[PDB]
């Protein structure tokens, strides 16, 4: 027909930068381009160019020569505006008891930006203040003016409407065929790799949609993994605990994959490091190289241990063997460019900052290749192959010292910037194989299979393997 009306169900909250508006909802300006790309890819059977030729045929294109855009109109409307707002932080902070009815908190979440909304400052929404009780525990205060001017909010809506209008009936039929798969495949909002903004289609033209989520995920993704989540017969009626557990588990699993887990007395070696150690001629952590460089100049890093020199029981060392040094590389760049590494040295109030930048202005960012899909309180880890453009790329490191001093009793602020130590640089060292370059050989499927098969008396990341 002409109009396609669908009712969407929200599974995880969406981080929206225009939360100030009452009617704020999922913007069609993201959905329509993504929907166009998805529909063209599925029309060409994995080839967007063949799909674009197919859509050039039948005259389904606005722009026959130029763009990927299809001729339809997207409208996303909220039926009822009872907003359920969330505060998302990557740190565990004490929860206050003075809140509006629709304020809820997610702590130890992968969303790490907007972390200054808690702490001690006049702008933080949750103002942590000293308590007359034991100093080991801190209370909290909620300020409505600061909460009204926050940059982004986690929002959860009720069932809302997506309207698709087109004068091309065949395009409308194709869109009806492909829309549930599209909403099962893509997450929306900020930090959509980590599970925020998960939506599914409930009704299409007043008809319920029955789509096997696992089958769609297998069809449209290379590797699929599902996590054995559990509910203790009580949190079924409390969504906050479910959300918190799901996002904490997501953060823990991703930390294990990328950078390991050392917080509370537990140490799980980063699986990326182990995979690169065990494979073809070994690539080791760039972080180990920066730690050695900052060791060789001065101030000792906090932590009564040593860098990990490989996989073994307590394989702890600070040096290299008598032959040539290890083949270092930017191991952790494949899962996302970080642009800054923070190192806490032995004395408090000073910290080493490593600024990461592309040698030439060619690489600026990289989305995490992994995608976390949260549907009906189940965690799905999906992913295609990585962007090969990042492999064998040069990276430049700029070390900077930041010594947070005592407050000047007038501003209580930070001006502790004017320090920078000149360490040694190893550009082109070992014929452009050093901590300035990426491993130039990596398959996401192979590493993902290597992970969740590493184990000790039980496999670490408790996900079984439905991969395609």
């Amino acid at each position: 027909m002409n109009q396609l009306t669908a009712i969407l169900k929200q599974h995880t909250p969406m981080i929206h930068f225009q939360h100030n508006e009452s009617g704020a909802t999922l913007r069609a300006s993201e959905v329509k381009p993504l929907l166009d790309k998805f529909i063209l890819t599925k029309l060409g059977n994995g080839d967007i160019r063949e799909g674009r030729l197919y859509a050039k045929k039948n005259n389904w294109l606005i722009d026959n020569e130029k763009n990927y855009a299809l001729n339809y109109k997207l409208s996303i409307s909220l039926q009822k505006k009872s907003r359920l707002e969330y505060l998302i932080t990557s740190s565990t902070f004490p929860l206050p008891t003075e809140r509006p009815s629709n304020f809820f908190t997610i702590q130890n979440s992968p969303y790490f930006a907007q972390e200054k909304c808690v702490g001690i400052n006049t702008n933080s929404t949750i103002i942590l203040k000293k308590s007359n009780s034991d100093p080991r525990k801190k209370e909290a205060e909620f300020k409505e003016k600061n909460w009204s001017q926050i940059d982004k909010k986690g929002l959860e809506w009720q069932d809302f409407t997506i309207k698709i209008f087109s004068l091309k009936g065949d395009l409308i039929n194709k869109i009806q065929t492909y829309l549930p798969a599209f909403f099962i495949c893509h997450n929306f909002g900020t930090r959509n790799n980590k599970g925020f903004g998960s939506f599914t289609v409930e009704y299409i033209n007043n008809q319920k949609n029955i789509c096997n989520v696992e089958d769609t995920l297998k069809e449209n993704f290379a590797f699929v993994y599902k996590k054995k989540i559990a509910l203790s017969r009580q949190s079924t009626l409390d969504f906050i605990y479910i959300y918190n557990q799901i996002f904490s588990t997501i953060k823990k699993d991703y930390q294990i994959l990328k950078s390991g887990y050392n917080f509370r007395n537990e140490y799980i070696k980063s699986l990326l490091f182990c995979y690169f150690v065990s494979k073809y001629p070994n690539y080791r952590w760039e972080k180990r190289k920066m730690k050695q460089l900052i060791k060789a100049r001065g101030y000792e890093l906090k932590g009564d241990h040593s860098p990990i020199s490989g996989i073994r029981e307590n394989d702890n060392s600070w040096n290299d063997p008598n032959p040539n040094g290890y083949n270092y590389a930017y191991i952790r760049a494949i899962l996302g460019l970080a642009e800054q590494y923070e190192f806490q040295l032995e004395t408090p109030y000073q910290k080493a900052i490593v600024k990461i930048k592309s040698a030439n202005n060619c690489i600026s960012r990289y989305k995490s290749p992994l995608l976390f899909k949260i549907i009906n309180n189940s965690i799905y880890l999906v992913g295609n192959e990585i962007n090969t453009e990042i492999l064998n790329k040069p990276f430049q490191y700029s070390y900077i010292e930041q010594t947070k001093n005592k407050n000047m009793r007038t501003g209580k602020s930070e001006i502790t910037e004017r320090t920078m130590h000149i360490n040694e640089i190893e550009m082109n060292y070992k014929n452009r194989i050093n901590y300035h370059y990426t491993p130039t050989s990596f398959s996401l499927i192979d590493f993902m299979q290597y992970a969740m098969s590493y184990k000790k008396n039980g496999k670490n990341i408790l996900n079984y393997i439905p991969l395609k």
Binding site: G23, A24, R27, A69, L167, S364, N387, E389
Partner: protein, 314 residues
């Protein structure tokens, strides 16, 4: 500078957005390459933007009351969350930081944001089948265009009127009478003074408890997924803002797939050949409801394919 846009104390929004936006203040540089991304330029443009986006429109505004007096009863519609963008092609781009990249349609005298009557007329005619000109560059796409728009307009006409079944030729005649006020061949129909369809300008009428203008971001992520995106800043009409659509519509009389005036039908009805089946009429209210349904289906303005300019019944 204050809220509650009034004739007594309020800057002209169009003047502030087009002429005072780029005023040559001392120690502000937006001509040189270095000055365009300077922070002073950003602060200057940011303060101008703050002034622009701080005005309110009371429901009982004398301006909108005068508009209702002059242009008749309004068609009141509100805006959905994305907003409403019009006149985006008007040049308002210097390449500086913190500036509104796209243009905006303001009334010259009043300064209130508005939708010109030509925009309304073209948006309504686009869904009608005989909008594309048979000129040669459109030979390929004319047939399918006409077919799909004819089907949609037939559905709308049947739904809104009491006509049980209307033909393609009658649809052509109705469209040409409504918009061109003539026959499809260009021949003028002997119409009276009040038998003309006038599409007045649409004016902002009510921003209930907020401002009527706001700033939005469109961020095109590049073809290269590794380079940073380039945000675009523009001015939008805020959600839940009442837009008043003013029309002057007539009654369209159709006899034997032809459009006739009131007098011609008055004489034709009396003749002892008047077929009731071959007579169709669309009142002004039915035509207004047809236009209302077209607007509620497709919306008006720019960036409509991505949800902007979508209207809801008040």
């Amino acid at each position: 500078m204050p809220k509650n846009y009034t004739l007594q104390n309020a800057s002209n929004l169009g003047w502030l957005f087009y002429k005072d936006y780029y005023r040559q203040e001392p120690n502000v540089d937006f001509i040189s390459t270095q000055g365009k991304e300077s922070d002073t330029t950003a602060d200057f443009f940011r303060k101008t933007n703050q002034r622009i986006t701080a005005y309110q429109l009371n429901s009982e505004s004398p301006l909108v009351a005068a508009f209702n007096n002059h242009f008749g009863t309004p068609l009141q519609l509100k805006t959905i969350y994305p907003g409403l963008i019009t006149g985006s092609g008007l040049p308002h781009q210097t390449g500086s930081k913190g500036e509104f990249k796209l243009g905006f349609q303001f009334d010259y005298t009043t300064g209130l944001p508005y939708i010109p009557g030509s925009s309304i007329k073209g948006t309504l005619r686009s869904m009608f089948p005989f909008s594309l000109k048979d000129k040669g560059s459109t030979k390929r796409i004319l047939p399918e265009y006409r077919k799909e728009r004819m089907e949609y307009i037939r559905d709308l006409i049947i739904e809104v009127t009491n006509i049980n079944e209307i033909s393609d030729t009658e649809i052509q005649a109705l469209e040409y009478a409504i918009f061109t006020n003539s026959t499809p061949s260009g021949k003028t129909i002997e119409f009276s003074l009040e038998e003309k369809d006038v599409f007045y300008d649409a004016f902002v009428a009510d921003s209930k408890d907020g401002v009527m203008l706001s700033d939005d971001y469109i961020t095109p992520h590049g073809e290269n997924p590794l380079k940073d995106p380039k945000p675009i800043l523009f001015l939008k009409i805020r959600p839940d803002v009442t837009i008043n659509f003013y029309f002057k519509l007539c009654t369209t009389h159709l006899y034997k797939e032809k459009v006739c005036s009131s007098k011609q039908i008055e004489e034709i009805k009396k003749q002892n050949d008047f077929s009731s089946s071959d007579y169709k009429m669309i009142t002004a209210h039915q035509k207004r409801n047809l236009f209302e349904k077209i607007l509620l289906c497709i919306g008006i303005g720019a960036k409509t394919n991505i949800g902007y300019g979508q209207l809801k019944k008040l």
